[PDB]
Amino acid sequence: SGFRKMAFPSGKVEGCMVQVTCGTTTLNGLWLDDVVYCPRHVICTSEDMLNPNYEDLLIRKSNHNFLVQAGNVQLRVIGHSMQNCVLKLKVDTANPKTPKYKFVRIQPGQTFSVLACYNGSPSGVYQCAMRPNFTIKGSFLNGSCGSVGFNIDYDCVSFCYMHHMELPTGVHAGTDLEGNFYGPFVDRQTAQAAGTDTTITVNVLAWLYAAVINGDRWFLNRFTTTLNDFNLVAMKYNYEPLTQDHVDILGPLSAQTGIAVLDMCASLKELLQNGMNGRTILGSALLEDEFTPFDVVRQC
Amino acid sequence: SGFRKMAFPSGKVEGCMVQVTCGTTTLNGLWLDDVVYCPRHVINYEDLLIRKSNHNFLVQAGNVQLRVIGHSMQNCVLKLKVDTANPKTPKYKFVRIQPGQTFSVLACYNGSPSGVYQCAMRPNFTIKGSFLNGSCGSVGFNIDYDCVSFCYMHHMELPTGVHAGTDLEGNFYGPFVDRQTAQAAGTDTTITVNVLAWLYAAVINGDRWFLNRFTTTLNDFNLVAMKYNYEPLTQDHVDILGPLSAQTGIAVLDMCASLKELLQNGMNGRTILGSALLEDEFTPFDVVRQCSGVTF
Numbered sequence: 001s002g003f004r005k006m007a008f009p010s011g012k013v014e015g016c017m018v019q020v021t022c023g024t025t026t027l028n029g030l031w032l033d034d035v036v037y038c039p040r041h042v043i044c045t046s047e048d049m050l051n052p053n054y055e056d057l058l059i060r061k062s063n064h065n066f067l068v069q070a071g072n073v074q075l076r077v078i079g080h081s082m083q084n085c086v087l088k089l090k091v092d093t094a095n096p097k098t099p100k101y102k103f104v105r106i107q108p109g110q111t112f113s114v115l116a117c118y119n120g121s122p123s124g125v126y127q128c129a130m131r132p133n134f135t136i137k138g139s140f141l142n143g144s145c146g147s148v149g150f151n152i153d154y155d156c157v158s159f160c161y162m163h164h165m166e167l168p169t170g171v172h173a174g175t176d177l178e179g180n181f182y183g184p185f186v187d188r189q190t191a192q193a194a195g196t197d198t199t200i201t202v203n204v205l206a207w208l209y210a211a212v213i214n215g216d217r218w219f220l221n222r223f224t225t226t227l228n229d230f231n232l233v234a235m236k237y238n239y240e241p242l243t244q245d246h247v248d249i250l251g252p253l254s255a256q257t258g259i260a261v262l263d264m265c266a267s268l269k270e271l272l273q274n275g276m277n278g279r280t281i282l283g284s285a286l287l288e289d290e291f292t293p294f295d296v297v298r299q300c
Numbered sequence: 301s302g303f304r305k306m307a308f309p310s311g312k313v314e315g316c317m318v319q320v321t322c323g324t325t326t327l328n329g330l331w332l333d334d335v336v337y338c339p340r341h342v343i344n345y346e347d348l349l350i351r352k353s354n355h356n357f358l359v360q361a362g363n364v365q366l367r368v369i370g371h372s373m374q375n376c377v378l379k380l381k382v383d384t385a386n387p388k389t390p391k392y393k394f395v396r397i398q399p400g401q402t403f404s405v406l407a408c409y410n411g412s413p414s415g416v417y418q419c420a421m422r423p424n425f426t427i428k429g430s431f432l433n434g435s436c437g438s439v440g441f442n443i444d445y446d447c448v449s450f451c452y453m454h455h456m457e458l459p460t461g462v463h464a465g466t467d468l469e470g471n472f473y474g475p476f477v478d479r480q481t482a483q484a485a486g487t488d489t490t491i492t493v494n495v496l497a498w499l500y501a502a503v504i505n506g507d508r509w510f511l512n513r514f515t516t517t518l519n520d521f522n523l524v525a526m527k528y529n530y531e532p533l534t535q536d537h538v539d540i541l542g543p544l545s546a547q548t549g550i551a552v553l554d555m556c557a558s559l560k561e562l563l564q565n566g567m568n569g570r571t572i573l574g575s576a577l578l579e580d581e582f583t584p585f586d587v588v589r590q591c592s593g594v595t596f
């Protein structure tokens with residue numbers, strides 16, 4: 001029993017964190033086999049952050065300009081290349097702690113663990129979700145760039161995020177490990193604003209099923225709804241549309257609890273209409289949207 | 301910016317998790333140097349233990365079986381002496397924590413780490429964890445520089461879904477026993493110093509709506525705290541909040557008057573750090589550590 005926001009054990013990722021220094025900038029790198037991955041903005045100076053030409057800046061760099069540090073050992077850079085917004089520093093030593101890994105690009109609503117680092121040293125691990133507006137609501141200070149988001153299924157690390165920047169609202173933007181930004185963001189100091197965020201509806205439903213599995217039933221009702229009527233209501237509360245894919249994904253939780261997805265959708269509509277009335281669901285006074293259907297099944 | 305419930309990096313603890321099997325029971329063990337620590341309920345515990353032999357305990361570190369060469373009991377923890385010292389043994393200490401103190405839990409099943417989360421030792425000595433069957437022997441810890449302080453070992457789930465366990469010397473937190481009997485968690489209270497630390501974290505993050513021009517005496521605040529099932533705030537707590545008070549410019553008794561107004565009037569549809577409830581599972585140290593980026 002119990003339901004916590006749970007992160008994956010970070011050990012397999014800790015053994016990959018290195019510090020990358022180029023000129024005055026110091027950030028984190030991910031050392032896998034003989035390559036160190038980090039945000040390409042590590043090559044940027046002061047007057048070339050509004051409109052940096054990364055190809056022009058990288059061509060002027062040599063391997064010895066990049067100082068890579070793994071613990072108290074300095075690694076030797078023997079090559080450098082750029083793949084989208086990520087810089088790949090070829091090093092002369094393969095990381096012996098390299099776990100079984102994959103690079104996966106995730107969709108909005110997906111959750112992952114973040115290992116927050118500073119100067120190549122892990123300082124904390126927390127759980128995140130990719131927001132529908134493609135930002136992540138993280139906890140990062142200056143120096144956290146290069147910190148990564150990941151999931152661990154079986155003994156394999158799926159790296160899904162690399163931190164690149166903080167938007168003016170305090171939310172965070174980054175890329176997958178192939179350097180492709182999540183969302184319409186760019187690694188430029190140009191005026192960028194996160195779009196209006198919405199609640200991840202399928203995740204709220206999964207969390208309502210977790211509450212039912214844990215014995216909380218007060219919010220349930222005798223109503224059901226059509227998928228379209230639910231979406232017309234949910235949209236008015238800035239909730240993401242619920243698709244047939246989402247209804248299908250909730251199938252196992254519906255089968256386990258005996259509550260049809262559209263029946264739980266009608267409980268959700270009622271919660272949106274009434275609020276919680278001084279009650280909590282799984283210790284929360286707000287509807288939680290950072291647990292996916294897969295997280296709920298895994299934790300329960 | 302941002303404020304998350306953040307656990308310590310679990311790597312140093314993952315390298316210590318082993319699976320202990322004795323008869324039909326399988327749970328987790330903590331392998332440090334040449335000793336495996338686990339709940340004694342894996343086996344009148346002195347009468348039960350005397351009947352066991354080393355070969356009855358199957359210890360597994362990954363796909364390698366460890367051989368037990370001795371066994372002894374220290375309070376509610378069983379200590380299995382093994383032939384091999386754990387090469388991954390970090391710098392560590394066994395520390396007993398106080399209610400209100402926070403720690404990270406590495407939840408394990410069959411000696412395999414599956415999740416990490418941050419929680420607080422409640423004033424009623426339970427932890428509001430997330431554990432299923434097989435999680436016994438999962439440990440709670442903090443990291444100081446490169447030293448792991450082990451503070452908790454999971455033993456059981458109480459009928460309300462809350463958890464109970466011991467320090468690494470086998471002493472329970474709370475008035476609990478490791479036996480099948482009627483046990484109930486006492487009425488819980490809110491960790492007042494932690495709520496204040498979290499209100500300072502909200503101020504550091506730009507959430508200032510709850511601030512007011514008022515201050516209060518420590519006695520008037522404690523009279524209100526008692527009324528709302530909040531733990532008494534001591535001069536020690538006020539002193540610990542000193543750095544956060546200095547950084548934000550809000551005296552502790554000034555933040556107390558904000559807390560008092562929140563308790564008597566509610567949040568009024570408004571939220572603090574994305575929460576509609578007052579969070580009490582961040583200590584003053586946790587807030588400083590997260591709003592300053594201390595590394596391990």
Ligand SMILES: C[C@](NC(=O)CN1CCN(C2CC2)C1=O)(C(=O)Nc1cncc2ccccc12)c1ccc(Cl)c(Cl)c1
Nearest residue numbers: 041140141142143144145164165166186187188189190301
């Ligand atoms: C590296 C970063 N540089 C800055 O923003 C630093 N700077 C720049 C403006 N300003 C001046 C000193 C007062 C700063 O503070 C960044 O946003 N990283 C940070 C990451 N996570 C959390 C942060 C929390 C506070 C601060 C910075 C954070 C950055 C900036 C613009 C771009 Cl286009 C990109 Cl790709 C990256």
